[PDB]
Amino acid sequence: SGFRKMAFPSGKVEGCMVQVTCGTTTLNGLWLDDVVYCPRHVICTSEDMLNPNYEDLLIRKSNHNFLVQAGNVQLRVIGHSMQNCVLKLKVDTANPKTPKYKFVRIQPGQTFSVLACYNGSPSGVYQCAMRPNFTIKGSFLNGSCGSVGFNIDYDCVSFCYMHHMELPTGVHVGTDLEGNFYGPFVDRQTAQAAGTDTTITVNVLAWLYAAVINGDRWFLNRFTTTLNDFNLVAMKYNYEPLTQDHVDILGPLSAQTGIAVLDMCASLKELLQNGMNGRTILGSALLEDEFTPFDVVRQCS
Amino acid sequence: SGFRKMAFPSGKVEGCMVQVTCGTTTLNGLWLDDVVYCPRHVICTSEDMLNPNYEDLLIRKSNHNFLVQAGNVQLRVIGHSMQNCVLKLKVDTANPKTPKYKFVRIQPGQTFSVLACYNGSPSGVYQCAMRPNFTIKGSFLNGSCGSVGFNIDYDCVSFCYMHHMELPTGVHVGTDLEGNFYGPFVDRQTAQAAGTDTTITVNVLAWLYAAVINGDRWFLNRFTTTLNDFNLVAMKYNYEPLTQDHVDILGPLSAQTGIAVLDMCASLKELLQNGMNGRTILGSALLEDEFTPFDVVRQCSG
Ligand SMILES: *C(=N)[C@H](C[C@@H]1CCNC1=O)NC(=O)[C@@H]1[C@@H]2[C@H](CN1C(=O)[C@@H](NC(=O)C(F)(F)F)C(C)(C)C)C2(C)C
Ligand SMILES: *C(=N)[C@H](C[C@@H]1CCNC1=O)NC(=O)[C@@H]1[C@@H]2[C@H](CN1C(=O)[C@@H](NC(=O)C(F)(F)F)C(C)(C)C)C2(C)C
Predict the structure, then answer these.
(1) CA angle A123-A124-A128, nearest 5°?
(2) From the CA of B80, how far away is ligand 1's center (Å)?
(3) Residues 6+ apart with CB under 8 A from A212
(4) Among residues B177, B228, B204, B223, which one has the least CA distance to residue B30?
(5) Impact of altering residue 205 to V (chain B)?
């Protein structure tokens, strides 16, 4: 029993972290085979960040302007190219700790583990949901850029995120491992806003199932709902509409507890219309939307 | 910015996790140098667990009755011994992935990272606080026994916890790496209760500093209080009394924010007296006590 926000073990990702310096800007790089991946803004001075022309900045940099360090050993850069908002530095040595890996683009609502790093040294590990407005609610300080988000399938590391900036609201933004930003963001020090955020409905349902598995039953009843009626109500509370694909993804949790998905939808509709009446669910006073059905299945089975 | 429940990177501990099997019971072991540490109930059947006489069960086991597997590498058990609730299995090979380490016994209020394992394989990492009643609010399924808790100081792993059992309330209990239970529990399948729990006051104050650092200032007021006046209110709401040692540990956060500890105590006193009125702090509708002053400084400065 118990239900906790849990990250994947970070070991295979720790063996890939390196320190990348260019002039007086130092950030983290991801060393996979003989290529180190990092945010391209490592080539910027504090001034350049206001309105950079990255092509003009990169032209002024030679391979010897990049100082890459793996622990205490310097890795010689023998080639360099820019792919969207990431820099790829070809190095003279292939990382012997390179695990099996793939680069993936995650979808809104999906979760990943973040290995927060400083000067190429892993510092912490936590779990994030990619918000519907393409922001994450992380914990990042100066020098944390180049820190990566990932998931693990048995022995394969799927890299889905690299950290680049923090928005005015305090939320965080970054790219996939091909340098393409998630969301309408640019790597420039200018005021940028994210869209209005919405609650991940399928994730709240997954969390209501984790609660029933753990013994919380006060919010259950024999009422039901059509998918359309639930959607008409949920969208008044800024919740995303539930689709058949979402219902299908909740199937294994529904089977495990014996509670039909549309019955849990009726309980959620009631929780939104009535509030929690001074009660808690899994020791929480708010409904939680940062656990996917997969996160609940992995912890409750 | 940001304040998240953060675990230590687990790689150093992942390299020490092994599968230990004795008969039909299988759980996790911690492989450091030529020794494997694991809960002693690995020598029990399900029936034995109801009322075990560990000494009579241990006497029936030989070195070859313990199957230890590191990945696919089978290790050879060349010695065995019981120390309190832990079994030590001497093996014929020193773990080359053994990090620099030490075994500590943590105090109530302190936090640690848990690497949850099943069949000797790491599954997930999370952060727990040792409650004042010596329980932890973890997440553990069958076969998780042997999973360990720890902290990391630069390159040295301080192992402080080994997982053994779950209480009827759904909370978790276990031992230090010497086999000594944290709390008044025994490794036997019989109804056992923990003491009444209390709120870790110093951790609530640390988390209030984390909130101000992050922009949350609505709860700040222009009042101050004394240590004694705060403690009269604390005892009424089942909060631990604040000591000078705890005030001294809040010093760095106090210096970073420019808010005196007794100015933050006045905000806490008002949150307890008036309640939170449905408002949130750091995205929480309830006061959080599972972050130490050390977890806050580590995350909000460096
Ligand atoms: C990477 N090392 C940092 C991570 C930041 C530092 C504070 N917390 C974080 O997550 N990245 C940056 O400093 C980037 C970098 C220039 C400025 N910047 C920002 O994150 C700024 N944000 C923005 O300009 C905004 F709002 F658009 F996201 C900052 C105000 C410093 C937080 C460049 C090249 C974008
Ligand atoms: C070790 N792999 C499990 C971990 C348990 C499984 C469910 N959640 C956990 O943390 N430990 C056990 O199975 C131990 C073990 C026998 C029974 N047991 C228990 O945890 C039971 N609890 C108790 O007996 C109690 F209340 F006293 F703590 C159980 C009811 C199965 C949860 C022994 C030898 C204590």
Answers:
(1) 140
(2) 55
(3) A220, A257, A259
(4) B177
(5) In strain: Zeta/P.2
Q: According to the entry, how was the structure determined?
A: X-ray
| The two structure tokens encoding residue B220 | 């700040």
The closest alpha carbon to B247, from B201, B288, B295, B297, belongs to: B201
A112 touches chain B (CB under 8 A): no
Strands (E) located in chain B = 17-22, 25-32, 35-39, 66-70, 73-75, 77-83, 86-91, 100-103, 111-118, 121-129, 148-153, 156-166, 172-175
The total number of structural domains that make up chain A: 2
Query: Comparing C-alpha atoms, which of A130, A178, A175, A177 is closest to residue A13?
Result: A177
Answer whether A265's CB lies under 8 Å from A225's CB.
yes
Report how far residue A235's alpha carbon sits from residue A196's, in angstroms, rounded to the nearest whole number. 13
Q: What stretches of A186-285 adopt beta strand conformation (E)? A: none
- Kindly report the CATH number assigned to the domain that includes residue B123: 2.40.10.10
Mutate to test the interface with B, among A12, A111, A126 (most CBs of B within 10 A): A126
Ligand 1 pocket check for A28: Cβ under 6 Å: no
Write out the two tokens for A1: 């029993």
Does residue B193 form part of some domain? no
Answer yes or no: do B10 and A10 touch at CB < 8 A: yes
Residue holding tokens 């501990």?
B13
B27 CB near ligand 2 (under 6 Å) = yes
Q: Which CATH number belongs to the domain containing residue B284 in this structure?
A: 1.10.1840.10
**Amino acid occupying residue B277:** N
What is the domain extent for residue A267? 201-300
Please tell me the distance between residue A95's alpha carbon and the centre of ligand 2 in angstroms: 42
Q: For this experimental structure, what is the resolution in angstroms? A: 1.9
The sign of the torsion formed by the CA atoms of B106, B109, B110, B114 equals: positive
